[PDB]
């Protein structure tokens, strides 16, 4: 549920919290945790390869099961948990055989709910089955692109995909971007939309919240000197040039997809 | 326990698969202590208009007294089952055991 | 609406002499039960205004009945409100 903060201080004035009382008030399941050290947007060459990253709160990596492989054996959801790594929420599930795994939490999923992966798996939210077994028209999330690879599409907070068509060995997917994409019919996908839908409604409220999320301040190109950015320089506020990246590439409109390998899967580009 | 009236059309290619389906449906109804008052396989029948590109369909009628949960389950089964094209579960006041005009 | 069997049961519970059905107390109980039933409905269906109107009317009627009981015989009223667990 969305909660607007009382303006007791400036910088608290605009803050909107997403408060979910269904989340686990306690420690994550340690066997599925692992160390996740920060980059600061720097590669193996130690150069900043992506600006505006650094700082933020220390985050343990939750080992989310995107692959979803436990076929036939039904799980029960123990608890929904906060995951710092993703916009979505995750759920600690417990298989009848004894294994515990984290999965992406779907929309209507709660504690005590039963889920199943497999071919025989019944069509209900949270359940995972090959897309040739899933009826056409359904909302689906955590979609595999290559059979067995692991969910790759519609992972984020409230996202989902529609199975618009099934034609032979390919199912056509209406991606969240609006892109129509052919994917193999034998690819695994988890029924329903991913859970934390109201995530977008939250507002950070102050610069500090951005920092906490590991985001360093973005400097306007036009603020810089000509040496620093193609937008740089000018007495007062000048900007006679067409908008470009820091590396002089048109930023308003200039299409940059070059991947000729995957072009055959793309039925229609997003609009 | 509410009196319903279920009528479902099956794909003409799946016509030999129909009796088993019927049996299964009956079984489920029986499970929740539900009565089955009249059951009429109308057979293969020519449609007034083509539905999803076909011109013939296999018609089945089934009047049943049951709870609503099982009816809901049946509806769900129908929706997910590709062999059954159309399905019309309809609430009825009485048992209506008497034969239909088209069978008559 | 309230099922026949339930109504009968209510009558049996609150009826001073057999299945009298008309008693003020009985009526109040019937209304109360209906209100309770409808609460669940209204939790689900927030925008069902026409139905809500009916509920409100029922509530009003119940209140009126309670008031009538109060002026008539206080002890009985008290007993009823112990039974049903209403604040006033």
């Amino acid at each position: 549920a969305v909660v607007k903060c009382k303006p007791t201080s400036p910088g608290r004035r605009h803050v909107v919290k997403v408060v979910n009382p269904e989340l686990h008030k306690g420690k994550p399941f340690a066997p599925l945790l692992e160390k996740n050290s920060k980059s600061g947007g720097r590669n193996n060459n130690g150069r900043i390869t992506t600006r505006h990253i650094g700082g933020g709160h220390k985050q343990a990596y939750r080992i989310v099961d995107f692959k979803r492989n436990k076929d036939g054996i039904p799980a029960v959801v123990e608890r929904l948990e906060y995951d710092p790594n993703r916009s979505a929420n995750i759920a600690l599930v417990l298989y009848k055989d004894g294994e515990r795994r984290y999965i992406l939490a779907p929309k209507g999923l709660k504690a005590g709910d039963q889920i199943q992966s497999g071919v025989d798996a019944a069509i209900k939210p949270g359940n995972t089955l090959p897309m040739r077994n899933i009826p056409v028209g359904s909302t689906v999330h955590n979609v595999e692109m290559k059979p067995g690879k692991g969910g790759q599409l519609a992972r984020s907070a409230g996202t989902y995909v529609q199975i618009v068509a099934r034609d032979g060995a390919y199912v056509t997917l209406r991606l969240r971007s609006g892109e129509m994409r052919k994917v193999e019919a034998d690819c695994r996908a988890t029924l329903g939309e991913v859970g934390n839908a109201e995530h977008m409604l939250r507002v950070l409220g102050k610069a500090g919240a951005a920092r906490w999320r590991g985001v360093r301040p973005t400097v306007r190109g036009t603020a810089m000197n000509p040496v620093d950015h193609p937008h740089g320089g000018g007495e007062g506020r000048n900007f006679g040039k067409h908008p470009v990246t820091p590396w002089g590439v048109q930023t308003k409109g200039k299409k940059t997809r070059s991947n000729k390998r995957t072009d055959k899967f793309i039925v229609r580009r997003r609009s | 326990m509410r009196h319903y009236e279920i009528v479902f059309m099956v794909h003409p290619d799946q016509s030999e698969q129909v009796p088993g389906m019927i049996e299964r449906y009956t079984a489920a109804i029986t499970g929740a202590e539900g009565k089955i008052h009249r059951l009429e396989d109308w057979g293969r029948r020519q449609l007034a208009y083509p539905i999803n590109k076909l011109h013939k369909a296999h018609y089945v009628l089934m009047n049943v007294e049951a709870p609503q949960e099982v009816i809901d389950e049946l509806e769900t089964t129908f929706r997910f089952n590709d062999a059954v094209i159309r399905s019309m579960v309809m609430r009825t006041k009485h048992a209506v055991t008497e034969a239909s005009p088209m069978v008559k | 609406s309230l099922s026949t069997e339930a109504t009968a049961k209510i009558v049996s519970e609150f009826g001073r002499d057999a299945n009298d059905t008309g008693s003020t107390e009985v009526q109040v109980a019937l209304l109360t039960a209906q209100i309770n039933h409808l609460q669940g409905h209204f939790a689900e269906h927030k925008k069902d205004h026409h139905s809500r109107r009916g509920l409100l009317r029922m509530v009003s009627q119940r209140r009126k009945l309670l008031d009538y009981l109060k002026r008539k015989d206080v002890a009985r009223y008290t007993q009823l409100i112990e039974r049903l667990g209403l604040r006033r």
Partner: protein, 66 residues
């Protein structure tokens, strides 16, 4: 005059296709109660039945559609 009153039917059946066919025109449209002489109570029932039939492909929505 009304045919349903003389017969005294409890409810008009959507499965009774032939009877329904008498109350729809060449283009598949429902014939008005003024033309048929049907009572208003039964007329609505008949209409409902026709609609049901249309849904269940027993009667057509229109003469054209193929």
């Amino acid at each position: 005059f009304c045919r349903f009153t003389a017969e005294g039917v409890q409810e008009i059946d959507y499965k009774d296709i032939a009877t329904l066919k008498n109350y729809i025109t060449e283009s598949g449209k429902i014939v008005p109660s003024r033309i048929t002489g049907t009572r208003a109570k039964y007329q609505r029932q008949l209409a409902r039945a026709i609609k049901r039939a249309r849904y269940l492909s027993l009667l057509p929505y229109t003469d054209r559609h193929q």
